[PDB]
Amino acid sequence: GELFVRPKLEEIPPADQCRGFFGPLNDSLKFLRLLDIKWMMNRAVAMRREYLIATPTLFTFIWMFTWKGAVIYFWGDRAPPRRMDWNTEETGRLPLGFKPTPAPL
Amino acid sequence: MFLFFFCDLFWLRLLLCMYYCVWSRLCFIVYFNCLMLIFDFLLFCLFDLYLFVGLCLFLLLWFMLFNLYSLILYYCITYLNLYLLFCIVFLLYIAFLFLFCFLCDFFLFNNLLVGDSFMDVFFIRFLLCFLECFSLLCRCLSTFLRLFCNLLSSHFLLLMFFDFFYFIFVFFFYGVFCYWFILFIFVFCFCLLFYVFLYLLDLFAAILQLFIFCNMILQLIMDFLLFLLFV
Amino acid sequence: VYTRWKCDRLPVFQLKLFTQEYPMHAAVGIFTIIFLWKHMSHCSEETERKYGWWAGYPYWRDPIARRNETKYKQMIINNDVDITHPKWTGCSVEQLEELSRVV
Amino acid sequence: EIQSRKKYFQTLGYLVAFIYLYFLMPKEKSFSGLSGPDGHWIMLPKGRPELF
Amino acid sequence: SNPADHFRPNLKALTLYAERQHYVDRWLHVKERWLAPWYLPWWSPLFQLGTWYSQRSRNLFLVENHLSYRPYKFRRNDEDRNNPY
Amino acid sequence: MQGSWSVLKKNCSNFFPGLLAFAQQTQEAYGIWLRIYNRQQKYGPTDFVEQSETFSPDYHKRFHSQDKNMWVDKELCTEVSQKEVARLMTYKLDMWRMAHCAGALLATGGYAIPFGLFWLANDTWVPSSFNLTGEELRAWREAQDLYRYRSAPSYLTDTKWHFDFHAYPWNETQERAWDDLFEKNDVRRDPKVVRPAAEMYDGFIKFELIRRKSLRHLCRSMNIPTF
Amino acid sequence: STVAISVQGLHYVGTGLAAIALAGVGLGIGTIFGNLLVACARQPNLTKMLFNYAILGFALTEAIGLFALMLAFLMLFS
Amino acid sequence: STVAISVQGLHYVGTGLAAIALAGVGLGIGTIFGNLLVACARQPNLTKMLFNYAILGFALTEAIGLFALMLAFLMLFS
Amino acid sequence: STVAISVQGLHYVGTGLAAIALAGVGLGIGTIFGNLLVACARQPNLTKMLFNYAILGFALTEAIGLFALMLAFLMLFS
Amino acid sequence: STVAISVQGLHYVGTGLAAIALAGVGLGIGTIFGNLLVACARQPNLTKMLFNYAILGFALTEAIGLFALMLAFLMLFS
Amino acid sequence: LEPMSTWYLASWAMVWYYAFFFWMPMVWT
Amino acid sequence: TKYELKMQYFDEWMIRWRKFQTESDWEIEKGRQWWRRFNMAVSGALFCGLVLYTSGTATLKRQYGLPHFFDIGVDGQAKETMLKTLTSRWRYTPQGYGRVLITGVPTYILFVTLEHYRERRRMQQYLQQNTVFGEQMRRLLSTGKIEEYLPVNIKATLPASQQAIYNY
Amino acid sequence: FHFHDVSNDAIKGMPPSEALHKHLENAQLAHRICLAKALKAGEPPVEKCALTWGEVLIRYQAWSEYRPPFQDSVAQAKYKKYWSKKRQEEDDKNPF
């Protein structure tokens, strides 16, 4: 809609103010910020880096709407059957008495 | 499997060659909004926002040569297939979308995250972003589905009504010479009125559907355009 | 003055149009064409019988059988294929002769 | 001048094509077999005994 | 049914059939003929464009180990749901 | 200019001498550019050396900024002469075209030979070193001028039409400058009258916001390969 | 015991159900024009502009009815 | 076992369902006229332009009702 | 196996459904007369023209009702 | 006794019922544009802004119909 | 219905692709 | 040597006759897949390194400077370390076609060379196999033609319940 | 000689490999019967046994393409993950 201006370094709130799923992950819990997705989302919104949330989604949709959708439809592995036809590992081996051709030399 | 067939435009191609060997002005366009995207002066766009004009005009010409002339009996809409229309809309829509995505400006997608900071990010805004990203593809699908369904339904109805009219006209016109001629005359007048109404409705609906088809693409383009102000 | 549409010949203008005016559209169209010819270019005999004929399949002459017969005759004659080989029949030539004498 | 000549020739060609298509060309896969081809195979291998 | 039959192309002229194996093999022969000459080194982008993607797809097909059965692409009858063969 | 057999013969005859001369010019121009680059890195402004980023206000795409990413070395005469600079510029053009041709050759292997035949039949994209006589050089310059004539009007019309359709000048002097800027060469344009158009267009479009199509037209008009 | 039955006539029932979707569409279209009349009487200077927006809304609303009508034809002709 | 059944009278059921599609059409038309009266009462000089738009809305709404009616008669004769 | 069945009580069910459409018509009548009174109060001078338009709306809505009613009676006696 | 039956024409009924959901979507769209037309006449200067919100509702309203339309295909073609 | 069919979709779409890649330039010029 | 032209026919034949694919051949193909992924990873790492080295000084300052998204403390330390390491020495920071060439040509060369030599390795592996696939590969390299229906000609091993066809 | 039963009812409870092999054997048997009839009649085999040879060819193509999956760690993991005890009980309960 309107033009977007990146926030200045002084306009970005501190990391400690961000909230996670339950509460802020302040000192003694900073390393939990990596695992809390909601905290990362709130931090990105605070830093005006909303694209980190939107870009992966849209692209994913495209990737599914374009390339993986048909790949799954045409070449995907359906659910296995109840009675399974496992491989006896007997096929392929050359018969006894066969003289294979020599390898290149 | 390779099937060799031909479109039903050969006579129309001949007419185009005959009547357009010399130049002529064009002043009436089905979708004029592709030429006037900006209405407030001093606003300009660095993106190629007028790239769609040629494709719009060609699509209008092609779809009009097919659909409008299809009202003539036995005229065939050679392209009338669901997945073929899907391919056409896929081409146009995905081409413009990949034009926007190849720009490699991620901030362009900031508006996908609906709402303000007050709304919970994970439980509200993220779900809205998911829904909007789904809604883009759904808009593509709805465009092609609408274009297919309108033609299919209109022509089915026309065929059925024409069959009924032929039946009553051929096998019950003798009632004109009988004592129940008034009933037949009333029915015949009603059938004529229905014939005219259906033809007018189809004529209008074809053009309107083309307008909407082009407007969906233009809306896709406009959703990601940003205008600078001259100073 | 020089203009692409007025000065260049049709093939040149076509290449310019689809390379410097609408290249992404051309790329997507080629992608879709490849997809169609990779996944939507086959029709089984049963499908042809069901929907492949304008008025219906004429079983009284079975043109599909004649077409396949011509195909296989041509392949055998041109490629010098011995259809009496045990792999095709599943039995030795002598067994085939015994069966012929039996039936 | 160029476009007039080109369009004249194109018009003649399209006229011939229209006549042939709508008055002479038979439809493929006729039920009776009296008109049109029933289809045939192409690109069959030739002179490749090892293929079988 | 009959009204539905009116929505068909009206200028069908000829239908040709060809096996996937045959024309794929012919295409491979053409590609080998055009990519064989010495003046096109294997490290050229053209040669890699020609060969690498096909090799990758074929390798992916070979590596496939699916628990389900994929019916033959070119059966005589693929309209019966209860008969994958 | 269209290709011809005479030009093909000329370029085929002078192919190897032209390559040798191009190599010598390459060595000389590398020396000159080394001097210039060392001077720029040593005495250049911090923004110019560090390659400061200037992003567009609409899509935030980086491009060269005329004020920050361009620097005039007022004291370059001490190290490099004017003739050396002209030689470097000419070699830059020739090297650009030769580099594009070499890239095509490497990409397509030996299949570029017929395209090379098309290339040597025209002087538009051959280096200046392929001309060993005055007449050949004159023909080469004629071809370059023909390409410039072919390309420039499109660029001028693009600029003028976009501005006039999406904006108008603020004051009468700007109007006069804008109108007189795009006059034909048969009349003489007064630079003092035309200069305010620079500020007006800076208000409209700076070099950092130049569109890709206009850039393509400009590079065509500057005899810079675009493919 | 395993018994498989195929009733032919059911396709009529499904076809009739889809037609019910037109009740909402037909009503929805009438709602648009009702507001159009009540709006043109409140600001007649924009009658042409309003008429344009009404038509756009009619097609979008009409489009949905076609989706249902397509299903009716599919089942009625299968 | 494979059993094929053909129920005759089902076409009556499907036809009745399509008739329900005329409920919204009839309601939609009534809505347009109701809004027309208010618009005329609130702007009496526009007694013709509003009337024309009401007719246009009726025509489109009638068209939807006729699309359904075609199925209603068609199934009744199938 | 091929089995043909003819149920002779399903010509009643279809008839009942066709009667349901009358509700969409009857309600439509009330809407026109529901807003006619308001219009008359707003502009009593036009008690006549509004009444004529309301009659036109009622007749057209009733026309839909009778189209549905025709299907109701046809399936009742057939 | 254990008896298993498979009625092979029932998917028509499910498809028609899903199609009925389109009536609400069509009605909602008509309501949106009806409010748009009666809202522009009140604040014309903001006509364009209202139109954008109106389309947004259509985008968020037509999507629901697709789910119902999606189910129709999943049962019609299965 | 052929409109819902896919047994010859590629050949069917060749018409649109020919129109886009070969006839549109002629109409353009 | 161009091994792909020879190997394409063999791969197509194996796909057509994948029933006789022993577990050894499957392991070979899985190893080929793994090596392709490894080549992709190393080429991408090289591309990223070249991009970082050729990045402009201001670009590096912006990327590896304040603010910190997490602000844990390790993030800032690592960013400062990398920024100092990159900005300490002089780096050639080209733009345009030059950066494209520098970042891409090495990556393309590495990826192509690795893939080609892995294809040669796979050809050798299939040559050393004692299965019907190995015999087909050897015959292809000898006569230059693919012999289809070879497994049924030389009577390659089949499951105990499918040996009736060989009963002749 | 005896043709195998490859009807839908019989095919339902059969592994894919067995069905493909049975189809191939039936095709071979039919081809050899046709060849024997041709030899008894004395007419050329190519003019009578082309269609049977083509059927044998297509059955061979279908039979040689299928490779039963190898039983390994990942395949067994997938099979056990999908076929849980709850799913097995549900399948047993279902009469279809």
Ligand SMILES: CCCCCCCCCCCCCCCCCC(=O)OC[C@H](COP(=O)([O-])OCC(O)COP(=O)([O-])OC[C@@H](COC(=O)CCCCCCCCCCCCCCCCC)OC(=O)CCCCCCCCCCCCCCCCC)OC(=O)CCCCCCCCCCCCCCCCC
């Ligand atoms: C085995 C049997 C034979 C068949 C073999 C086939 C082999 C196939 C190989 C495998 C292919 C697999 C893939 C197939 C996919 C098919 C998809 C498809 O069809 O999609 C539908 C789609 C339909 O498109 P459309 O919208 O209808 O428009 C296309 C039209 O062509 C119209 O579009 P347009 O108007 O925009 O086109 C431009 C047009 C612009 O307008 C014109 O130029 C006007 C003319 C139009 C001509 C073209 C229309 C043809 C109309 C029907 C046929 C006309 C009559 C033929 C009579 C035949 C009699 C037996 O210009 C031209 O057409 C240029 C050509 C002009 C030729 C003029 C020749 C003049 C000769 C004069 C000689 C004088 C001699 C004097 C001597 C005097 C001595 C004294 O088809 C296509 O897009 C084209 C598909 C082609 C695919 C490639 C096929 C391979 C090439 C085969 C050539 C065979 C030549 C040998 C035949 C010999 C006779 C038997």
Ligand SMILES: CCCCCCCCCCCCCCCCCC(=O)OC[C@H](COP(=O)([O-])OCC(O)COP(=O)([O-])OC[C@@H](COC(=O)CCCCCCCCCCCCCCCCC)OC(=O)CCCCCCCCCCCCCCCCC)OC(=O)CCCCCCCCCCCCCCCCC
């Ligand atoms: C064998 C494997 C082959 C692989 C496949 C290749 C396929 C073909 C692709 C093209 C390959 C290059 C072709 C040769 C170009 C000539 C050399 C060159 O760069 O000229 C300078 C020139 C630089 O242009 P610029 O715009 O002035 O550069 C701006 C910079 O700011 C300039 O910076 P500055 O302003 O500070 O000034 C510096 C200037 C100052 O210098 C001077 O002023 C003196 C003159 C120096 C340049 C002289 C060039 C002479 C060109 C003609 C040569 C003779 C041709 C003879 C032909 C006839 C033969 C019979 O010096 C330079 O120009 C240096 C530029 C940077 C170096 C670029 C080279 C990097 C690659 C080489 C290393 C590879 C190592 C592999 C390690 C492997 C590890 C596993 O190059 C060009 O004109 C650009 C190329 C134009 C064609 C582009 C085609 C598309 C490329 C896409 C590539 C994508 C990645 C690869 C995968 C492709 C898959 C599709």
Ligand SMILES: CCCCCCCCCCCCCCCCCC(=O)OC[C@H](COP(=O)([O-])OCC(O)COP(=O)([O-])OC[C@@H](COC(=O)CCCCCCCCCCCCCCCCC)OC(=O)CCCCCCCCCCCCCCCCC)OC(=O)CCCCCCCCCCCCCCCCC
């Ligand atoms: C020994 C030498 C030294 C060593 C080597 C050194 C290195 C050399 C190489 C580098 C040289 C670079 C410079 C080259 C300059 C010249 C370029 C050029 O061509 O100029 C035009 C050149 C004339 O130039 P000019 O007269 O000097 O005018 C120049 C002006 O300045 C006009 O200038 P302009 O700018 O206006 O012209 C530009 C025009 C240039 O174009 C043209 O002018 C078109 C040329 C062709 C026109 C053909 C017309 C005739 C058609 C005939 C059709 C057949 C007829 C029937 C035949 C029956 C036979 C029995 O347009 C373009 O630039 C378009 C570029 C398009 C790029 C396409 C990129 C596609 C990418 C694909 C998408 C990828 C997306 C990413 C996907 C990623 C996926 C992961 O054209 C010709 O001479 C025409 C030649 C026609 C030959 C005959 C027809 C074709 C024969 C084919 C035979 C096939 C045999 C095998 C068949 C096998 C079947 C199985």
Ligand SMILES: CCCCCCCCCCCCCCCCCC(=O)OC[C@H](COP(=O)([O-])OCC(O)COP(=O)([O-])OC[C@@H](COC(=O)CCCCCCCCCCCCCCCCC)OC(=O)CCCCCCCCCCCCCCCCC)OC(=O)CCCCCCCCCCCCCCCCC
């Ligand atoms: C710029 C464009 C913008 C416009 C976009 C426009 C379009 C819209 C966007 C969306 C796309 C629409 C779709 C259009 C169609 C395009 C074609 C398509 O979709 O084809 C897919 C198509 C899908 O394959 P398929 O044909 O379906 O076959 C499936 C098979 O999987 C195939 O099998 P395969 O043998 O080919 O192998 C494929 C392999 C591909 O992958 C590989 O081959 C291996 C990995 C490659 C890495 C590449 C380099 C990455 C950077 C290296 C490091 C750099 C830094 C170095 C310095 C470090 C200092 C410390 O993938 C896999 O199989 C998955 C393996 C995953 C292993 C995971 C192991 C577990 C540990 C690692 C993960 C978990 C870590 C947790 C950490 C937790 C920490 C707390 O092709 C592929 O995806 C595979 C081939 C192409 C691979 C390209 C690799 C590079 C990708 C780009 C990376 C950089 C850019 C992204 C980041 C940007 C940041 C700013």
Ligand SMILES: CCCCCCCCCCCCCCCCCC(=O)OC[C@H](COP(=O)([O-])OCC(O)COP(=O)([O-])OC[C@@H](COC(=O)CCCCCCCCCCCCCCCCC)OC(=O)CCCCCCCCCCCCCCCCC)OC(=O)CCCCCCCCCCCCCCCCC
């Ligand atoms: C036959 C050959 C076939 C080749 C196939 C390969 C593709 C084509 C090859 C190349 C073709 C030639 C042309 C290429 C494009 C040229 C673009 C250009 O003009 O750049 C100028 C530009 C120079 O201008 P500059 O002023 O110096 O700098 C640009 C400004 O910063 C600009 O400033 P700014 O303001 O614009 O800043 C923004 C700028 C900032 O970026 C830059 O400009 C920096 C350079 C790029 C950095 C990219 C790496 C980012 C970090 C990746 C981290 C990955 C971690 C993954 C970890 C996984 C762990 C398991 O752009 C971005 O932000 C874009 C970031 C990239 C986003 C990627 C999104 C991908 C989404 C994927 C969707 C899903 C895919 C499918 C599913 C896959 C998974 C299953 O060049 C560059 O910066 C680098 C150019 C590199 C060219 C590509 C080299 C190709 C090498 C190929 C090697 C492999 C060959 C394989 C062959 C296979 C057999 C045949």
Ligand SMILES: CCCCCCCCCCCCCCCCCC(=O)OC[C@H](COP(=O)([O-])OCC[N+](C)(C)C)OC(=O)CCCCCCCCCCCCCCCCC
């Ligand atoms: C912009 C709006 C355009 C509106 C145009 C309005 C046209 C009005 C036509 C009035 C009636 C014309 C009757 C023609 C009768 C022809 C002979 C005949 O038997 O026909 C019966 C046919 C069919 O009648 P039928 O269905 O009764 O046929 C009975 C035949 N049996 C019993 C065997 C089935 O008539 C028609 O189909 C006419 C329909 C016309 C509909 C309007 C089409 C408009 C679009 C095409 C415009 C083309 C312009 C091209 C100009 C050049 C372009 C470069």
Ligand SMILES: CCCCCCCCCCCCCCCCCC(=O)OC[C@H](COP(=O)([O-])OCC[N+](C)(C)C)OC(=O)CCCCCCCCCCCCCCCCC
């Ligand atoms: C009666 C049944 C009816 C069913 C109807 C079903 C709906 C049918 C609708 C058809 C019409 C609409 C079609 C819309 C378009 C769909 C597009 C689509 O899904 O296509 C996907 C498909 C996917 O291709 P694929 O199916 O061959 O996938 C191969 C994947 N393996 C090998 C694992 C099996 O695309 C294509 O077919 C085109 C492929 C070639 C072009 C792209 C090449 C570049 C690929 C880049 C990534 C990988 C390489 C590395 C990078 C590059 C290196 C150089």
